[PDB]
Structure 1
Amino acid sequence: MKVEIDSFSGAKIYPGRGTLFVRGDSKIFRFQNSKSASLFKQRKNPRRIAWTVLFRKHHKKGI
């Protein structure tokens, strides 16, 4: 199997878990759950959502 990464939060996606979304510019996004999927559809920036890997990498928290 392959363990994919969340396109919004960077969480690990196990097989059969979450959803996938193909945008009209032929780019693939993978969501581990409906929470990150809905934040993506609400167009929030993952650099400003405090629990994401990209936020913690930006803010040097636990790095």
Structure 2
Amino acid sequence: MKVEIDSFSGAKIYPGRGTLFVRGDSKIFRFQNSKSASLFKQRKNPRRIAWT
């Protein structure tokens, strides 16, 4: 049973948690919650988000 990383916050996604998103080309994305996903969706830059 794996544990993935948030592809924004770099947090730990345990089974069943968060959400998965499959962009246009085919790159797969992962968010541990509605927070990192919302930031990604606004196109924030993680390198600017303090807690990342």
In the superposition, the TM-score normalised over structure 2's length comes to 0.98
Residue 22 of structure 1 and its aligned partner are, at CA, apart by 0.3
In structure 2, runs of 5+ residues without a counterpart are: none
Residue 21 of structure 1 and its aligned partner are, at CA, apart by 0.2
Structure 1 vs Structure 2 CA RMSD: 0.3
How many residues of Structure 1 are paired with residues of Structure 2 in the alignment? Answer: 52
In the superposition, the TM-score normalised over structure 1's length comes to 0.81
Residue 47 of structure 1 and its aligned partner are, at CA, apart by 0.3
Deviations 1:22-57, CA, capped at 9 Å, x for gaps: 0001000000000000000000000000000xxxxx
- Name which one, 1 or 2, has greater alpha-carbon Rg: 1
Taking only the aligned residue pairs, the percentage that are identical comes to: 100
Q: Which has the higher contact order (CA 8 A, sep 6+)?
A: 2
Residue 16 of structure 1 and its aligned partner are, at CA, apart by 0.2
User: Helix, strand or coil for the counterpart of 1:36?
Assistant: helix
Q: Which residue of 1 aligns with 2:30?
A: 30
